[PDB]
């Protein structure tokens with residue numbers, strides 16, 4: 001009978017006590033697996049009939065199903081002296097490297113499937129896991145977070161690839177299992193961890209097709225606390241004038257990132273809509289993969305870290321710029337590429353953004 005939910009509580013005041021919130025859910029034979037820190041809500045398991053009675057309880061604002069998100073990136077092509085994947089030059093990160101700016105002391109949370117900390121071309125500084133039976137964030141079960149982390153911060157050294165912001169402080173925030181999928185509640189926990197740990201930048205190369213009140217809250221909270229939040233638009237293509245952008249990219253607080261190829265063409269699979277903000281390379285993106293290798297993937301998942309790393313570049317040159325200034329620079333120096341339904345403000349140009 002039981003399904004997975006998020007139970008949102010009316011704002012002030014009760015509800016705000018921890019114990020009371022347990023009760024409202026207990027006394028409908030519900031079970032609570034987590035009360036969020038920044039969202040006035042709890043992740044709960046519930047059956048059919050408790051729901052209708054929860055919805056009736058005057059202290060409850062909503063009951064929504066705890067949704068599924070997934071990584072927006074796929075394998076495309078699968079020792080070596082260091083090369084620079086094209087995307088990095090496309091967004092003009094090298095110009096920042098040449099002024100000595102590479103993202104140092106910038107804290108970036110990779111909210112994904114984990115990051116392979118043993119990879120020689122990555123440096124992971126910390127993290128946590130919110131996937132209940134896959135508790136080590138340094139074991140990237142699906143290989144996706146490792147690839148995303150390489151675009152952001154692959155070491156500038158003698159091997160493999162180079163990240164947009166190669167000296168950025170990388171954090172693995174595991175919220176997708178082996179299968180490349182996560183409950184919305186695990187993602188929320190991931191984001192909450194990033195807030196409490198003072199990340200400067202959040203990267204989410206993942207998404208789901210359904211909205212969530214608790215999800216909006218927490219992404220809004222992160223941005224409100226001064227964190228730059230980049231989210232992949234999704235890979236669902238177009239569909240007339242209907243927006244196909246995924247959540248949380250769909251929320252205006254996040255920078256929604258779509259995919260262009262090396263010719264600056266909107267990629268095929270690249271979700272479109274008015275919630276699109278900027279574009280970045282997501283076709284044939286070379287990066288780090290677990291077990292010490294490299295490989296190319298396609299996805300708005302691979303475009304997003306370009307933006308996340310760009311933000312880290314900008315912050316390493318301009319440490320007093322807040323997320324709003326970084327976001328503004330990125331969007332308002334972007335390179336116009338066509339209709340904003342399709343391209344947003346266009347291709348990010350970290351060189352121009354960082355002037």
Ligand SMILES: [Ca+2]
Nearest residue numbers: 155157159161
């Ligand atoms: Ca390298």
